[PDB]
Amino acid sequence: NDKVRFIKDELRLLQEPGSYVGEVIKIVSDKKVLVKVQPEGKYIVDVAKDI
Amino acid sequence: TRCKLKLLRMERIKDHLLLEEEFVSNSEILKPFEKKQEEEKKQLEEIRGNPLSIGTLEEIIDDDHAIVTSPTMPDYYVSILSFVDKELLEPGCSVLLHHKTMSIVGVLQDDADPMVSVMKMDKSPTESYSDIGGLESQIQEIKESVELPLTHPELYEEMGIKPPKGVILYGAPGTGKTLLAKAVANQTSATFLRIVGSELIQKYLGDGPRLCRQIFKVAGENAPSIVFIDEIDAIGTKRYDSNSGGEREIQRTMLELLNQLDGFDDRGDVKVIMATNKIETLDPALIRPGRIDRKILFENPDLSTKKKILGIHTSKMNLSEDVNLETLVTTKDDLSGADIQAMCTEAGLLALRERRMQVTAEDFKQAKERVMKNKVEENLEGLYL
Amino acid sequence: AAPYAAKLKQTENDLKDIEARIKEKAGVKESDTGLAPSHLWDIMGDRQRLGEEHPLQVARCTKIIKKYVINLKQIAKFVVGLGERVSPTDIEEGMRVGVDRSKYNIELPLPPRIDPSVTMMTVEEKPDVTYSDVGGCKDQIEKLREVVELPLLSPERFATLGIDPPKGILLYGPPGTGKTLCARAVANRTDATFIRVIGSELVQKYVGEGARMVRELFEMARTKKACIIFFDEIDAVGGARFDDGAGGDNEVQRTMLELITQLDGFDPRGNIKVMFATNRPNTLDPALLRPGRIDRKVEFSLPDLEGRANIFRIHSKSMSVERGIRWELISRLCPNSTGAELRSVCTEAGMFAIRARRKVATEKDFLKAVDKVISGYKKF
Ligand SMILES: Nc1ncnc2c1ncn2[C@@H]1O[C@H](COP(=O)(O)OP(=O)(O)OP(=O)(O)O)[C@@H](O)[C@H]1O
Ligand SMILES: [Mg+2]
Numbered sequence: 128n129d130k131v132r133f134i135k136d137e138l139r140l141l142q143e144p145g146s147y148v149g150e151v152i153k154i155v156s157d158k159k160v161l162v163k164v165q166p167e168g169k170y171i172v173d174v175a176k177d178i
Numbered sequence: 179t180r181c182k183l184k185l186l187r188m189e190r191i192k193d194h195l196l197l198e199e200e201f202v203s204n205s206e207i208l209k210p211f212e213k214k215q216e217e218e219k220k221q222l223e224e225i226r227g228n229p230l231s232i233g234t235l236e237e238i239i240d241d242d243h244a245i246v247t248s249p250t251m252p253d254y255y256v257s258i259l260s261f262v263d264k265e266l267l268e269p270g271c272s273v274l275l276h277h278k279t280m281s282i283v284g285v286l287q288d289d290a291d292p293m294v295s296v297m298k299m300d301k302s303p304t305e306s307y308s309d310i311g312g313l314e315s316q317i318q319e320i321k322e323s324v325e326l327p328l329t330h331p332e333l334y335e336e337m338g339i340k341p342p343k344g345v346i347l348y349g350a351p352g353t354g355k356t357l358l359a360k361a362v363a364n365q366t367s368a369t370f371l372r373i374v375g376s377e378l379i380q381k382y383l384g385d386g387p388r389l390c391r392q393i394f395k396v397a398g399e400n401a402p403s404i405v406f407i408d409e410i411d412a413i414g415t416k417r418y419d420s421n422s423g424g425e426r427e428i429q430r431t432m433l434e435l436l437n438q439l440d441g442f443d444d445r446g447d448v449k450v451i452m453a454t455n456k457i458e459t460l461d462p463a464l465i466r467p468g469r470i471d472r473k474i475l476f477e478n479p480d481l482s483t484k485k486k487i488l489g490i491h492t493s494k495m496n497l498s499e500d501v502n503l504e505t506l507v508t509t510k511d512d513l514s515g516a517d518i519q520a521m522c523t524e525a526g527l528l529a530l531r532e533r534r535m536q537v538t539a540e541d542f543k544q545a546k547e548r549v550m551k552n553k554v555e556e557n558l559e560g561l562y563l
Numbered sequence: 564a565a566p567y568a569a570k571l572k573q574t575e576n577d578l579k580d581i582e583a584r585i586k587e588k589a590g591v592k593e594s595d596t597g598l599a600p601s602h603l604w605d606i607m608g609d610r611q612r613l614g615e616e617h618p619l620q621v622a623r624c625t626k627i628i629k630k631y632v633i634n635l636k637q638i639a640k641f642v643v644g645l646g647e648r649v650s651p652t653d654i655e656e657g658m659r660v661g662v663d664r665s666k667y668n669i670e671l672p673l674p675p676r677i678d679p680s681v682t683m684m685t686v687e688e689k690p691d692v693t694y695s696d697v698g699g700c701k702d703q704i705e706k707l708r709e710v711v712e713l714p715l716l717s718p719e720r721f722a723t724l725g726i727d728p729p730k731g732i733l734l735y736g737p738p739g740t741g742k743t744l745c746a747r748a749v750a751n752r753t754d755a756t757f758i759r760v761i762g763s764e765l766v767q768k769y770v771g772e773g774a775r776m777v778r779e780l781f782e783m784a785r786t787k788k789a790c791i792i793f794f795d796e797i798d799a800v801g802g803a804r805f806d807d808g809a810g811g812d813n814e815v816q817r818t819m820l821e822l823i824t825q826l827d828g829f830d831p832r833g834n835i836k837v838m839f840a841t842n843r844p845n846t847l848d849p850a851l852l853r854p855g856r857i858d859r860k861v862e863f864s865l866p867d868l869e870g871r872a873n874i875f876r877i878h879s880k881s882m883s884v885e886r887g888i889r890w891e892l893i894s895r896l897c898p899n900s901t902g903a904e905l906r907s908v909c910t911e912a913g914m915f916a917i918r919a920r921r922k923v924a925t926e927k928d929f930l931k932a933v934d935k936v937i938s939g940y941k942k943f
């Protein structure tokens with residue numbers, strides 16, 4: 128059962144379009160961080176609930 | 179020693195006390211959410227869907243529209259909607275624009291770049307004043323240009339003379355030039371910016387001149403300040419050659435800094451510490467006094483100077499009280515203060531090979547032979563003929 | 564010994580935790596600009612946000628064909644048309660346009676080019692300096708009056724002689740000669756506008772972007788009346804060629820070229836004076852130096868003994884000095900050098916007096932300051 132589950136999970140992860148990588152330039156008190164998203168320009172963007 | 183212990187006791191009850199206070203004080207239950215806060219909050223979430231793609235405000239036209247360039251090659255003629263005052267916004271400001279429709283939702287940026295943060299190095303100077311074994315006379319030339327208008331403006335004001343602009347440190351390495359730099363920095367408690375001049379040597383197009391402008395902006399914002407352009411000569415007189423793409427860059431960077439050092443007038447509130455090995459046998463690029471004022475040549479250490487430096491070091495050593503201090507310094511010719519520092523370090527290393535935990539009475543007379551011989555070889559002076 | 568070692572070890576941990584606790588302090592409180600009554604503005608703002616007329620993608624007419632052929636900045640061409648009603652006569656080659664995201668129609672013609680706005684930040688208006696407190700009695704000071712003031716104040720005499728009105732002056736001198744200082748003084752007195760251009764700042768390049776800026780700025784000038792365009796430090800970029808190098812470069816030849824041709828041949832001018840600041844004429848491309856670009860060149864001549872007593876006096880007034888102090892004697896001992904060297908001597912004389920714990924600088928102080936500066940320059 129677990130193997131059938133495993134192959135499926137591998138399938139579902141790959142779907143995700145985009146997915147990048149920035150660097151936290153500075154931190155502000157607005158539940159945000161200014162990030163220079165590296166392939167793109169800059170984005171000031173809110174934090175996810177997890178971090 | 180003891181003086182240091184007295185302080186530890188106070189520092190450890192200050193931190194403790196603060197930390198405990200802080201919980202309550204910050205909030206944890208205080209939770210301001212009364213009418214003034216609630217307003218701000220509600221609005222901010224509504225208006226701002228995120229991510230928010232920043233712009234630069236190029237011009238205003240009075241009709242609550244602005245013209246901004248976004249990071250996209252198409253620019254966008256935008257509405258100003260909500261938050262930030264029209265007046266408060268002046269052209270050249272960087273701005274937050276809303277991603278669905280580009281509108282001025284505020285500013286919180288002020289042309290924040292990572293470059294400014296990197297440069298910004300106010301952080302704890304490792305030197306306090308006169309921890310150094312240097313001579314009173316050398317430090318009290320740097321102090322005269324830099325300290326003395328901030329501590330006593332009365333005398334400068336009364337005379338009517340302008341406060342000096344800049345100094346140049348040059349020696350002779352092993353005179354502790356950068357030690358001197360961070361002795362000064364501690365006393366003033368000024369925003370102490372630092373940038374190294376090789377970061378302004380690159381093949382990258384026009385980047386040198388952009389960096390040069392940043393430096394003047396930074397200092398002025400965070401004034402009173404000391405700007406350490408360390409190895410100023412990296413940009414200037416010192417080379418990286420021109421058969422490497424350098425026939426473009428080096429010219430443009432040298433000129434650019436030169437032009438801003440004179441400016442329309444000397445700022446007279448930004449102190450500079452300019453480091454360079456010496457500009458005696460190098461070309462001069464630090465363009466005449468009045469923009470660099472007093473120029474400071476540190477002496478090569480004489481016999482009395484190295485006595486003072488030597489006293490620091492002998493304190494930790496045990497069995498150097500029987501050793502006559504005076505005769506070690508004399509016998510050696512006048513040489514760097516670095517060479518006395520080298521000797522102390524070698525001395526301990528050498529005791530260990532003899533097998534004695536700290537120096538033996540014998541170890542110290544021996545130490546001098548190994549260090550003097552090594553250093554005279556490294557640096558040979560003209561032989562008398 | 565040993566029980567007091569462990570007092571150091573404890574200390575260090577504490578200091579580090581306090582610093583991280585700063586983040587917690589800042590908290591989560593968010594508040595943005597727009598106090599007093601600009602948050603009541605935001606309530607109007609909300610419905611108009613959902614509303615649509617903003618943004619407009621910006622493009623530029625590259626040809627009007629009686630619809631219009633627009634070219635966007637991503638580089639992509641479309642034939643479009645008028646939106647609500649956009650007169651034919653408004654849309655011209657080079658004129659920006661506001662067009663809709665995707666319905667691609669002109670709403671408003673927009674003023675031509677976004678590049679003037681960028682460069683208008685650099686521009687500084689009519690600086691002010693008083694000609695009387697301009698140090699020296701320099702000959703140079705006088706020839707500036709001929710170039711700038713006299714054609715503006717009385718253009719009649721020039722017509723009558725049937726000479727061309729002087730309009731070009733090239734300033735060069737060692738640093739500290741006072742090139743910037745005298746230009747600001749004659750800007751003020753003649754009561755003519757001023758345009759600050761700094762050529763050292765040009766770096767925006769795409770093979771000939773630097774040439775666009777320069778044509779626009781010079782043209783801005785023509786539109787203006789009674790004006791000065793002061794290109795500062797044209798020693799490099801629009802100064803020297805970097806062709807000479809092994810791999811070489813010619814983004815600087817583009818910028819240089821454009822300037823030469825605007826100056827050279829027919830081209831209207833609205834009483835445009837051309838001031839050029841080069842530290843040395845040597846660095847300056849010979850193309851510019853030789854005539855038909857800038858009309859006049861003056862080699863700055865270092866101030867006379869009378870002019871050097873004169874700069875010193877300016878400084879000495881700012882100072883608190885001894886009565887009967889011999890300005891002239893101090894000056895004579897001093898080298899024939901810039902107004903700069905003299906500024907420095909008064910600066911150090913002040914300081915040695917302060918150190919010595921005096922509020923009035925003695926004659927003797929300035930004997931010391933002099934000895935200091937001579938040696939400096941020499942040793943290098
Ligand atoms: N006529 C003068 N009287 C008094 N001091 C003078 C005079 N001219 C220049 N100086 C002094 O020289 C210094 C610089 O003057 P200024 O900025 O005009 O220089 P410049 O020759 O235009 O130089 P750069 O090569 O840096 O562009 C200042 O300290 C100023 O007081
Ligand atoms: Mg060092």
Ligand SMILES: [Mg+2]
Nearest residue numbers: 440742743840
């Ligand atoms: Mg100048």
